[PDB]
Design a protein around this ligand. Sequence first.
Ligand SMILES: [Mg+2]
Ligand SMILES: [Mg+2]
Lengths: 612, 622
Amino acid sequence: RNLFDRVLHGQAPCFALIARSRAMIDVFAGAVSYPSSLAELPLAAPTATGADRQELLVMVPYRQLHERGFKTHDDGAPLVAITCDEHETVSAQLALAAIPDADTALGERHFDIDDEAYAEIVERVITDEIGTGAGSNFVIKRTLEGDLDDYSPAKALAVFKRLMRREVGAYWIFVIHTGERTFVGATPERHLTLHEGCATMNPISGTYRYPQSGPTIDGINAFLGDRKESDELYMVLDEELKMMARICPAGGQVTGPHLREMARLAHTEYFIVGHTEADVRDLLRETMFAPTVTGSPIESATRVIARHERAGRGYYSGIAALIGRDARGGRTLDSAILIRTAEIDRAGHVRIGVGSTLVRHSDAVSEVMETHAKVAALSNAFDPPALGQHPSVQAALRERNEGIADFWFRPYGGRAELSGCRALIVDAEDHFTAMIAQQLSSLGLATEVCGVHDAVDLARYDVVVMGPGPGDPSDAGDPRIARLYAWLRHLIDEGKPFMAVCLSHQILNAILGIPLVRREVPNQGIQVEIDLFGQRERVGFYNTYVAQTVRDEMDVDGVGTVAISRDPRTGEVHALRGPTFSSMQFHAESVLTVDGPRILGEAITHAIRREK
Amino acid sequence: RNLFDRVLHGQAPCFALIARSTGSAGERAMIDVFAGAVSYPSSLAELPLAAPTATGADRQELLVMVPYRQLHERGFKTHDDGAPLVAITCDEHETVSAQLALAAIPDADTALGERHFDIDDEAYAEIVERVITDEIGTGAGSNFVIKRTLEGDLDDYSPAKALAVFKRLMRREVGAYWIFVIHTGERTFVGATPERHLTLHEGCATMNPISGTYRYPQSGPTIDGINAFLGDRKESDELYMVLDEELKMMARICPAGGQVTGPHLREMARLAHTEYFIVGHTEADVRDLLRETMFAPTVTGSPIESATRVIARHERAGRGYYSGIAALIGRDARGGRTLDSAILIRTAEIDRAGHVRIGVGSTLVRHSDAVSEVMETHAKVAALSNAFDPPEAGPALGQHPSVQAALRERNEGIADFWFRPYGGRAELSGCRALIVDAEDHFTAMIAQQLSSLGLATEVCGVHDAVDLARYDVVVMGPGPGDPSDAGDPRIARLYAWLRHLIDEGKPFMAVCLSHQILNAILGIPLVRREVPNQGIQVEIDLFGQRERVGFYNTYVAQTVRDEMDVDGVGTVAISRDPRTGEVHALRGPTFSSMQFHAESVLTVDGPRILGEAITHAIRREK
Ligand SMILES: [Mg+2]
Ligand SMILES: [Mg+2]
């Protein structure tokens, strides 16, 4: 059982998961202590083991600034040091799949200082501090607050998980649990890195708030052309250059700037690199805390912060530092600024600090909106933010079943005059015939299906049904179509009761001397209200060619008088009723036909009229 | 999870991963993982199927891929492209948790090279118009599907790459009936199909006619869009037609016929479909059921036999497995026949070469509009296509040339010094300077720049006690606060320093706060700027020379005078804004001062300007 599994099952009372820079997660565990100063951090003498090794994970709280002679609201937040007794790496994707989900909804979720209040403080800082020469820029914290129910670290694991899957452009994504306090966050900004004497800082400032609909090229350009935003960045550049001038004898060298893209916002940024050989404790002490989260000049910024924030800061604007050794015993520092981070206590009470760099041309409502944008990804990580399930859609779907065939919706189990009658169904290459058989069956007929070329004894049946099919009914050069002409001529001649459907209805019309025409707009898969021998019916059509006539009755040699149901406007024929037969252009069997079985029954009843 | 890891390391040459729909509401997704031997029967009659057996548990026997060509078993015409009936014996079968599996699947470049449709949009539209006019319009039938093929080439193709596409598909696509990758040795299938072909469980047969397509806007689906779609006559007719056609098929395989339920909206990642279900009862042999249901009308047309005729007339190419069936054949715990089958649409066939074929069509009806049907094919292929070539993989907003340019502009016309390599970067050459810090570490930046000019430097605090004989120039630093606030102990102390320097004739350069105090000492008035100059670059006239300099100040000295005589000092020259009287710099007999920060990243040519300040301050020294 690796360390990460032990962390997952609560076997590690003190641990850290840190996703830095397959993406890998660093997994740490060991002993907690709370030393009294940065001087007293438990660091051993130098040793090179032949590989990189982390020694201490340290959380520096805002109050630590006492070590620099600066005033803070002292809230007792300890300097935390966790000895990296164990350290493994696990694949980010694998880890996340192992992490169980959890309800991490924030209860009684609100800011300690609301928008109107925060806006008044912003204005005050601009007028009374920047406007009286206290400095050029300042960051004033406020705190998003909430309560997790049944809090345990597993819930922090769940938030870490969503953060990893949803947030982008972070420098560190992490969850650090010390025993009494849990930190979860996705910070964009390193505090200070140190590798082989090369120190790096990352002054970040300037913020583009993504619209709900997503970032745009126009939005970004307008931001990159905003004087306020540009000045903001140069100011923290300058401030961080002072810091680098202090810890690095030859000073810093700027590179950049870059656009850091995150999930809800984008930032502008520069990098500063320089050389230093100072002790890591000194470097930490002397860089408390980045100007991007305090202000400038720094000592005056702490004064200003104390004047306008009634509460202490906890770890907000503080540092999480990984202190370690390279293969050859050289000092290494990877540290990040504790912003975009939640502090959770044993009770489940969640504090998320957030501020903004206030400048002489800051607009207060924007800075308010900027704080919302900054907490947005973390906040979503706690409380993540259907068309089918919409009542308009549910309604429109239900409408599809109104005014179509009831039969086909009835349970295939439970669904006189004709009961007992034997029918033969002749298939013209369209399995609509199988549907015709089922419906005739439901009327009490016994039924049998065969093909057009098959040789059949026509004494075993009371009524013959001439089925539908593809093609042009005028096409006697199609052997199948010619074959159907033969069948119908034979049925008519013999006086055998029959019902012709669609293609065969058409053929019958030709045989009786009624013209066939092609419809310009075909009637292929359409339900139509028609007068069927004096009764409104709604029926399904699947035809392109149609019989056309001006006559409502026609007298035909070798047959007798045939009644014709037609459209009076167009002359299009829907059905024939002859002395010994009936026919339909439409498909009674179709889902598009209403009361198909009734209609077929009336068709059959009529066809067998001279029998009795 | 050993069958899966073996699949992962090349140790199952023939396998399938199939993510099926079964799973109860509040359960992890699971993936079925199969492996065994490939065979190629000559017919459905001859599928390698054993006599009935029961083990007390469900068991899969065969995974079968039925190609379009197989329609010859029904006497229907087909362009014969040799696509074989493929049967894979389910020798091994395990299930893995989808999330764990997917995490284990390595990513890969699966970009499709030389990506194109074999029949382009204009061409395809002409074929669509033709079918409507010449087929539907001459009584061949009511509706028809005509295939075209999205084509491309995977580089360095191996099945790992197929696993990668399957992975993204699992992550991105929704509303699929099966999401799968099937690898036979010689051919690989990857897809996300929405449509079962036929299921069979305890004699209960089910089909799922789907047709009608709402294409999601690039912006995302809307309620209005859906309603407009659900009210479209073309689309609702389309679905009723395909319903009728599947009812016929069910009437043939089920003695008592089929029973309709629905309709429903199936929501996918890029589109939504309307759908019905039909259920019924049958006891036919699975081979007979597969044979008689070749192939769904939703992907062929109607009437079926005429549809195959129409398809043959308008497609040059054979269909491969497009519109075919992927069938899991098996037994329930007590020996009854089991069938789970899916329609091979929204699927890629990859050959051993890496060449990829994705068949796609649309249901053509009398009121089809040809350009819409073109767009419909794009929407249908869109999820799969994205599984190969994701959108997020494309260039970042940040890499846009307007952004690259605006960032680059931030470095024009500011301090070159701070961008120069740190180690890196006559007349002041020997000179020793003392920098007095007034609570602003701009002093460390002044030190660096002075140093770069050849001065030796030392930084101290305002309250520190020093021997000034050890230095040639003193620099009186900047800091916070109001320069008129002589009741502030720090500010009082700056006044004392400057009085002392002036009185001693000791060369000095005053910066910002100290520049301001020096102005007070010389009798020049101090004011609060209405608009503060805190963090700003400004072009100024500095003793007759245009400079661009960085300001960090709120208060300023003001005067009408360009030069003034001051008692105990001498003649002081003043560089000021001629419009407002704001003082930027002083040049005295023994000193110089600046309101601005020469050392700032906002100042152009800072070191030069410092050098000139220093050069001037020391002008009486020898
Ligand atoms: Mg800002
Ligand atoms: Mg369609």
